[PDB]
Ligand binder design. Structure first.
Ligand SMILES: *[C@@H]1O[C@H](CO)[C@@H](O)[C@H](O)[C@H]1NC(C)=O
Ligand SMILES: *[C@@H]1O[C@H](CO)[C@@H](O)[C@H](O)[C@H]1NC(C)=O
Ligand SMILES: *[C@@H]1O[C@H](CO)[C@@H](O)[C@H](O)[C@H]1NC(C)=O
Ligand SMILES: *[C@@H]1O[C@H](CO)[C@@H](O)[C@H](O)[C@H]1NC(C)=O
Ligand SMILES: *[C@@H]1O[C@H](CO)[C@@H](O)[C@H](O)[C@H]1NC(C)=O
Ligand SMILES: *[C@@H]1O[C@H](CO)[C@@H](O)[C@H](O)[C@H]1NC(C)=O
Ligand SMILES: *[C@@H]1O[C@H](CO)[C@@H](O)[C@H](O)[C@H]1NC(C)=O
Ligand SMILES: *[C@@H]1O[C@H](CO)[C@@H](O)[C@H](O)[C@H]1NC(C)=O
Ligand SMILES: *[C@@H]1O[C@H](CO)[C@@H](O)[C@H](O)[C@H]1NC(C)=O
Ligand SMILES: *[C@@H]1O[C@H](CO)[C@@H](O)[C@H](O)[C@H]1NC(C)=O
Ligand SMILES: *[C@@H]1O[C@H](CO)[C@@H](O)[C@H](O)[C@H]1NC(C)=O
Ligand SMILES: *[C@@H]1O[C@H](CO)[C@@H](O)[C@H](O)[C@H]1NC(C)=O
Lengths: 135, 135, 135
């Protein structure tokens, strides 16, 4: 990456800002900007690049061979009983939540078993979070 | 990436902003902008690139051979009983939720078993989140 | 990375800011800007690059062979019973939550079993968090 920017309200190269109840009188503004940007990113010179994978089996006796990749989820139990009993009562539930297995951004990058990788990998995940706003 | 920008309200190269109840009188503004942008991104010179995968089996005795890839989900149980009983009562539920297995953005990038990859991979996931807004 | 920026409110190269109840009279502003940016990022010169993986099996007797990758989740139990009983009462729940297994940003980068990797890997995850805002 080069320029990652997070701004809460206002981003401005040149900002002449005037707010309320302002007497803006007799202003003379002169501005010169000479901006140059030069970027040389991911410039690659490879004369040769080799990837080789070889598997040879000969006169072999293989048994019970078991290979399991990543992310092996087994025997998972989620239990949320919710019993509510009334007896001449007064319930005011304005903002209540029951949440299980909640995802916003889930990025997987090259989840495999056997990998031969050459190159560039970039991940950007920038945000703002407001899970609860209950007046 | 080069320029990732998050702005809450306002993004402006040049912003002459005037707010309410403002007496804007006798203003002389002069502005010169000379902006140049030069980008050389993902420029690649490869004279040669080789990917080779070879599998050879000869006079072999294979048994019980089991291969399982990634993301192996088995015996998964989700249970949310919800029992509500009234007895001369007053319930005011303005904003209530029961959520299970909720996703907003789910990106998978090259989830395999055997991979031979050459090149560039980029992932961008930028957002704003407001799960709950209950007046 | 080169420039990671987090700004709460305002980001400005040049900011002439005026607030409320201001008498802005007799201002003469002169500004010259000569900005040059030169970036040479990820410039690579590789004359040769070799990746080699070889597996040879001969006259071998293999048994009970078990290979398990990373992230092996087994026998997982989550239990949240919730029993509420009323007896001539007054409940005022304005903002209450029950949360299990909650994720906002989950990034996986090259989770495998056997990996041969050449290159660059970049991860950026910048945000603002507001889980609870209960008036
Ligand atoms: C504002 O500028 C003008 C000329 O541009 C000048 O004659 C005047 O005296 C200045 N002030 C006011 C209050 O007008
Ligand atoms: C920028 O503009 C001003 C006039 O506002 C001038 O005097 C100056 O020479 C300029 N600079 C360039 C580099 O052009
Ligand atoms: C890549 O291209 C040629 C080939 O090697 C090389 O002479 C040149 O200097 C390189 N360019 C950059 C911008 O690195
Ligand atoms: C492994 O192989 C033997 C026979 O050689 C077999 O009895 C056994 O059940 C195998 N293992 C599994 C886990 O099945
Ligand atoms: C505003 O500028 C004019 C000429 O552009 C000038 O005659 C005047 O005095 C200035 N001020 C007011 C209050 O008009
Ligand atoms: C920009 O414009 C101003 C006039 O507002 C001038 O004086 C200056 O020479 C200009 N600069 C360029 C580089 O053209
Ligand atoms: C890529 O193209 C040629 C071939 O190698 C090389 O001479 C040149 O310098 C390279 N260009 C850049 C922008 O890197
Ligand atoms: C493995 O092979 C044997 C016979 O060689 C067989 O009895 C057994 O059931 C196999 N394993 C599984 C898990 O089926
Ligand atoms: C403001 O500037 C003008 C000329 O630009 C000048 O005549 C005046 O006396 C200054 N002050 C006021 C209060 O106008
Ligand atoms: C910038 O502008 C001013 C006029 O405001 C001028 O005197 C100066 O020479 C300029 N500088 C350059 C480098 O252009
Ligand atoms: C990369 O390109 C050529 C090839 O080796 C080399 O002569 C040059 O100096 C390099 N360029 C940079 C910007 O490092
Ligand atoms: C390992 O192999 C033997 C036979 O050689 C078999 O009895 C046993 O069950 C195997 N192990 C497992 C965990 O299955």
């Amino acid at each position: 990456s080069i320029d990652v920017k997070y701004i809460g309200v206002k981003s401005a190269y040149v900002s002449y800002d005037v707010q309320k109840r302002t007497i803006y009188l007799n202003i003379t503004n002169t501005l010169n900007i000479t901006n140059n940007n030069y970027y040389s990113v991911e410039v690659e010179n490879i004369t040769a690049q080799v990837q080789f994978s070889k598997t040879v089996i000969g006169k072999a006796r293989l048994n019970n061979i078991t290979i399991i990749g990543p992310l092996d989820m087994k025997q998972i139990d989620y239990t949320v009983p919710t019993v509510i009993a009334e007896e001449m009562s007064y319930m005011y539930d304005f903002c209540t939540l029951i949440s299980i297995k909640v995802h916003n951004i889930v990025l997987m990058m090259q989840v495999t078993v056997t990998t031969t990788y050459f190159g560039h990998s970039e991940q950007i995940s920038q945000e703002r979070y407001q899970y609860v706003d209950c007046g």
